[PDB]
Amino acid sequence: MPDLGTPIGSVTDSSPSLIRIEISSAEDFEKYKSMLGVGQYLLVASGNNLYLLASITGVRATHVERNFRFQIDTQPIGTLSEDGEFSRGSHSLPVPTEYAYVTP
Amino acid sequence: LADPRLQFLFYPKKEDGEDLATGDFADVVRQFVGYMTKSNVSIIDLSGIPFEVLSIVVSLISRMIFDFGFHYSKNRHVGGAVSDVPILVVCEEAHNYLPRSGGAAYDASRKSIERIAKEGRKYGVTLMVVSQRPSEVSETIFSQCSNFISLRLTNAVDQTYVKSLLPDLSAGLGDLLPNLAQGEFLIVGDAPLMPTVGHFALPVPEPHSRSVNYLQEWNSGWRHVDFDSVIDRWRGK
Amino acid sequence: PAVLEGIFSHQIKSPFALGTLGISPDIKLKIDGDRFFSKHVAVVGSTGSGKSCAVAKILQTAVGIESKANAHKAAQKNSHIVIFDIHAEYAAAFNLEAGEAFTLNLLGVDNLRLPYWLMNAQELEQIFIESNEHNSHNQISQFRHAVVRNKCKHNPTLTNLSFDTPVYFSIDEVVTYLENMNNEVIGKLAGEGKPKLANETLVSDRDELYFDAVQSFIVASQAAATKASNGPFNGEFDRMILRLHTRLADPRLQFLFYPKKEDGEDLATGDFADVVRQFVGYMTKSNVSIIDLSGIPFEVLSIVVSLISRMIFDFGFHYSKNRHVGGAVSDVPILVVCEEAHNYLPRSGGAAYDASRKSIERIAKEGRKYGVTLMVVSQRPSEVSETIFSQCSNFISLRLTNAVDQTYVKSLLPDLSAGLGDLLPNLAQGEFLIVGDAPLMPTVGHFALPVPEPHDFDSVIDRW
Amino acid sequence: LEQIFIESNEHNSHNQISQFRHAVVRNKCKHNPTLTNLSFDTPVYFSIDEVVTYLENMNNEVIGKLAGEGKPKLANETLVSDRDELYFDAVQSFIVASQAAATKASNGPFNGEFDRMILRLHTRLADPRLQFLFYPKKEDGEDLATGDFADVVRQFVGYMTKSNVSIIDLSGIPFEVLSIVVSLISRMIFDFGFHYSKNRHVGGAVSDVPILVVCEEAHNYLPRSGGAAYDASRKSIERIAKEGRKYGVTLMVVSQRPSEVSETIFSQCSNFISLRLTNAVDQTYVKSLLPDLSAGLGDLLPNLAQGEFLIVGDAPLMPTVGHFALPVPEPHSRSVNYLQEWNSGWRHVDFDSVIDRWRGK
């Protein structure tokens, strides 16, 4: 319902048991590092007027040059609409190029 | 039969001056349970009990409580209802008296506790288990617990055991345990809507046991020992 | 959508609508009906979820009711159901308005007509006597003689009777005899080897009076002028009569001790069929029959259910033989639908909880052949016996959050896959897990809602 | 024998089962004089009615505690040296024991101190479903006696110079005794192979009369995880798996849930016929049981049409896939369909008649 701000990253790989998010800017990461720890929750977008609630289960950071990659792995728990109804169960699947936000 | 430490079992005598007749029975249970109304928190001190009969004492107390609940909740179960007076049994340092591998000497402690595990909800007696070495504690008792609270754990074995037990806990969320700060915890099971990491504040009053400090006291001089009086009380009889 | 329902059920002859396989209502799961109802089915969920709506929806479809209307208003089809209810939640589901003309046989504490003399020896012994007293060695013997002879006095016709055989007798005559034998006194003087009375008369045997009436006699004395002996147990089992007379005074169980008809008299040996008429539904021609037992105390539930089950099973057995001589299979199919089974089917082989178990166990083994089938539902699957669950062909389990329960629900049935096992805790409302033979190919489904919807410390020790 | 007549739930077994072991023997002998004496397992005649009578009579005896007069106390004081003379005709209540000099007597721990089983025995006898064990009768009307033994076997065997098929219809039998039944039948059929294959094997030649046993829905009575009560059948059948080939009695198993069957029985099977299997654990169990088939040929099972099978074993040159034809006549079961009957209307139930039949007598 409330404004969720500016997104951290986009989806790269999707599946009913795993979701991978990528960040390519260290300035943002350090900005929100506190809320990106294992055990915390993220909101992802599947469609218009719908969001999914996923739990982090891994973080990796790498610097390869030939620059920064940050990978975050998640596991979905349920769904939340714009009105604010939290329904457990995750049948839907998010398509790549969709955004991720930190849960206020 | 002579041993003075062990005379709460053998030579109990009434407070007035009389001995304990079969009718006095009620009184003993009164001290554990208390008044039905007006919540009570009884505390057994097992520090000064001899290490020979501890498991007997626990079994005895446990059976007494369980039976009281049986008899109280027998009829009030009019339709699928629980009792107004529910008990809670808190077992600290469980591995001392509920070992995974032990000889008959500690069997008496399993049989009772396991009863409460298999069949307690019907009568209102519930448990709480606390251990700093979850590996050594009996296996059957853990798997009968619905919710779990876990704080920092550093030894590999207990990490793996606890990681097996909790089903919703995956391989990923278990890597979190060795990284928890002071007063931070991970909660799982039915009570919470979603698994979560949280944090406690300090309690008031704090529990600080009357431990004996050696090298805080080893730097003072000879405290003259009135050996005479020591032995005088040690004559006894 | 069109093709899948056909691929589902055209191979079959008698299909059953059972919901919506996906989100779209057009996708109607059409399970094979017979295999579903011809064998035992289990629906065992968790608290905080709509298992009751699903059960009611299945049953409503089974009987024809839908949308607050009875499709079979003019005629009555041949469906026979018997539901055990403990939370008192199922009466309304079927209680629709009169215009549709549906006769529902509600039943409960107030109007039951279930006597004591139907019961077998095993239950009866627990009903009156309690083993905890530990004075049984002789009192039970005298008890047994009393209950064996009481039947004799009331009736002359039958022959070669026994303790278990169900015939008409009184508990009051028994307590009279027990009192007067406790107070029995024999005259010790010469030629007085029989009960010596207050009027100094002797009787040939106790039967003439003691069952019939209470009596007072002379007191014992050492002196020959006053010598007499008491009953062997005089002042031994007075406690027996005490606990018993206190047991009876209970109001909750007044039906059991004395069931009076509508006219007012108590039932008799010949007045038998009526009782069977009640639980089945042929007395008022009502298909469904509910039994709300909430009023009953937690101790006697097993006795009640066992007696009912024995009746329901024997009925179909004897009908099946009466027709086998005719050369056909039974036409009256009955289905028992338990609710809150754990209360009377515990895992821990408690003594009382044994009486019912074997009975219900019987229906699981030998039922299909005779006409009677079983459907189980309990909120806590952990505290229920495994033998029953093991037999049921088809499983439908709802949201199951707890761990101790879901490990059980998994361990009972290995047909459950590894990938789909993780789905049982995470479910949306209405979603169920179906597995077994009835589905032409397995599925996962959810339902819509049903309309109508289903609604002194010192004292304790004395017992110990 | 122990299972049928004694239920180990009670904790009085320590003395009770021993008392039963003792009780049986004396009568077991006392009936058969020609065959002099026997033992506990010996299958020769006895009577359970009068064992019940003795164990009930031991509840009312009053033997004299006099000094120099050790004789029992009867109404006319008839002296009996042994029990046989007077327990049979009618249970003999004797004069109540007392401390009086004239009628002093002894009373022990057998004066009815295990009655609770006395209660259940009469009931087991009263059960009219199980008449066929406890009161078998001939066609003439008289009861069975040792000489009749032949019949109890012939029904299964039939005749040497012709072929027969016997079909036990275990559906009607109650559920608590089915395992005992199967155990006994198997023992008999095996012992009629031992005896008859005494000589004709002169140089290892199979007999003229071979017997094939068929075990349908095995997991009912040969469970992998089952309590002692269901263990009898586990033994008797296993014996055939071990040492039946020598004597001429074979075995066939038919299961629809192989995982829950005993491991040894399948282990001692030489040919395997597999139809479609659609569950995983059974798939793995089979994939292990027989190692001739590479892991790759195992993925063939979940996709086999109706009447297509895989045969693997010593009989054929090479593992193969085949197709059955339909059987004429077909096997059918007279099962009852429920929703096909509900569609029909109400049916008047002549309750009076069903109840009259229920009455008995």
The C-alpha of B193 sits at a distance from chain A's nearest C-alpha, in angstroms, of 10
- Comparing CA positions, the residue from B17, B49, B11, C322 lying closest to residue D356 is C322
Q: Is C74 exposed, middle or buried (0-12, 13-18, 19+ CB in 10 A)?
A: exposed
Resolution to 1 decimal, in Å? 2.8
- Comparing CA positions, the residue from C271, C179, C285 lying closest to residue C234 is C179
Please say whether the beta carbons of A24 and A36 come within 8 A.
no
CB contact under 8 A, B176 and A38: yes
The count of other CB atoms within 10 Å of the CB of residue C271 is 14
Please say whether the beta carbons of A8 and A21 come within 8 A.
yes
Distance, CA of D152 to CA of D320 (rounded, Å): 43
The count of other CB atoms within 10 Å of the CB of residue D108 is 9
Distance of CA A31 to the CA centre of its chain: 16
CB contact under 8 A, C426 and A89: yes
Phi, psi of A54 (to 5 degrees): -120, 150
β strands within chain B, DSSP E: 87-91, 125-129, 148-150, 184-188, 196-199
- Comparing CA positions, the residue from B109, B100, B95, B11 lying closest to residue B60 is B109
Task: Show the tokens assigned to C292.
Answer: 């709300």
What angle, 0 to 180 degrees and rounded to 10, lies between the N-to-C axes of helices C136-154 and C172-182? 130
Angle (CA) C402-C405-C410 rounded to 5° is 115
Phi, psi of C294 (to 5 degrees): -60, -40
D63 DSSP β-pair partners: D72, D106
Residues shown for chain D: 361
Partner A, chain C 414-453, Cβ-Cβ below 8 Å: 426-428, 431
Task: Show the tokens assigned to C300.
Answer: 């006697």
The single-letter code of the amino acid at D338 is: Y
C42 DSSP β-pair partners: C376, C395
| Chain A CB contacts of C428 below 8 Å | 87-89
- Comparing CA positions, the residue from D48, D174, D46 lying closest to residue D118 is D48
Lookup result for tokens 């709509």: C50
The single-letter code of the amino acid at D288 is: S
Phi, psi of A24 (to 5 degrees): -125, 15
Please say whether the beta carbons of A51 and A1 come within 8 A.
no
The single-letter code of the amino acid at C333 is: P
**Contacts of residue C458, Cβ cutoff 8 Å, sequence gap at least 6:** B26
C81 DSSP β-pair partners: C288, C335
Lookup result for tokens 């027990």: C178
Please say whether the beta carbons of D254 and D216 come within 8 A.
yes
Distance, CA of C311 to CA of D337 (rounded, Å): 22
Distances (CA, A) of C146 to A58, C163, C178, D58, D126: 77, 10, 8, 22, 21
Three-class DSSP labels, B17-41? CCECCHHHHHHHHHHHHCCCCCCCC
Strand A41-45 relative to strand A99-102, pairing? antiparallel
What ranges in C78-234 are assigned the alpha helix state H?
Answer: 91-94, 121-128, 136-154, 172-182
The count of other CB atoms within 10 Å of the CB of residue C75 is 8
The C-alpha of C429 sits at a distance from chain A's nearest C-alpha, in angstroms, of 9
The single-letter code of the amino acid at D46 is: F
Task: Show the tokens assigned to C241.
Answer: 């009569």
**Radius of gyration in angstroms for the set of CA atoms belonging to chain B, rounded to a whole number:** 23
Distance, CA of D134 to CA of D131 (rounded, Å): 5
C199 interfaces chain A, CB cutoff of 8 Å: no
3-class DSSP state for residue C341? helix
Distances (CA, A) of D184 to D133, D168, D191, D264: 12, 13, 11, 20
Distances (CA, A) of C282 to B122, B139, C105, D348: 38, 54, 10, 9
Distance, CA of D4 to CA of C445 (rounded, Å): 46
The single-letter code of the amino acid at D272 is: F
Please say whether the beta carbons of B86 and B125 come within 8 A.
yes
- Comparing CA positions, the residue from C429, C424, C432 lying closest to residue C403 is C424
**Contacts of residue C35, Cβ cutoff 8 Å, sequence gap at least 6:** C393, C394, C437, C438
The count of other CB atoms within 10 Å of the CB of residue C372 is 26
The count of other CB atoms within 10 Å of the CB of residue B136 is 18
Phi, psi of C77 (to 5 degrees): -85, 175
Experimental method: cryo-EM
Q: Does B touch C (3+ CB pairs < 8 Å)? A: yes
* Nearest chain B residue to A72, by CA: B172
B111 interfaces chain C, CB cutoff of 8 Å: no
C336 DSSP β-pair partners: C82, C374
Distance, CA of C440 to CA of C447 (rounded, Å): 19
Q: Does C touch D (3+ CB pairs < 8 Å)? A: yes
Task: Show the tokens assigned to C200.
Answer: 């100094």
Q: Is B202 exposed, middle or buried (0-12, 13-18, 19+ CB in 10 A)?
A: exposed
- Comparing CA positions, the residue from B51, B71, B53 lying closest to residue B61 is B53
Lookup result for tokens 């709802």: C398
What ranges in chain A are assigned the alpha helix state H?
Answer: 26-32
**Contacts of residue D315, Cβ cutoff 8 Å, sequence gap at least 6:** D271
Distance, CA of B186 to CA of B178 (rounded, Å): 12
| Chain B CB contacts of A59 below 8 Å | none
The C-alpha of B143 sits at a distance from chain C's nearest C-alpha, in angstroms, of 7
| Chain C CB contacts of B119 below 8 Å | 346, 348, 383
Q: Report the b/e string of C4-27 with b at 16+ CB within 10 A.
A: ebeebbeebebbbebbbbbeeeeb
**Contacts of residue C414, Cβ cutoff 8 Å, sequence gap at least 6:** D259, D279, D281
- Comparing CA positions, the residue from C31, C35, C41, C16 lying closest to residue C338 is C41
Please say whether the beta carbons of C183 and C217 come within 8 A.
yes
Half-sphere exposure of B88 (CA within 13 A, CB side): 8
Q: What's the N-to-C CA distance of chain A in angstroms?
A: 11
D250 DSSP β-pair partners: D212
Distance, CA of C119 to CA of D319 (rounded, Å): 61
**Contacts of residue A50, Cβ cutoff 8 Å, sequence gap at least 6:** A79, A80, A81, A82, A92
**Contacts of residue A23, Cβ cutoff 8 Å, sequence gap at least 6:** A8, A9, A29, A68, A69, A70, A72
Please say whether the beta carbons of D197 and D243 come within 8 A.
no
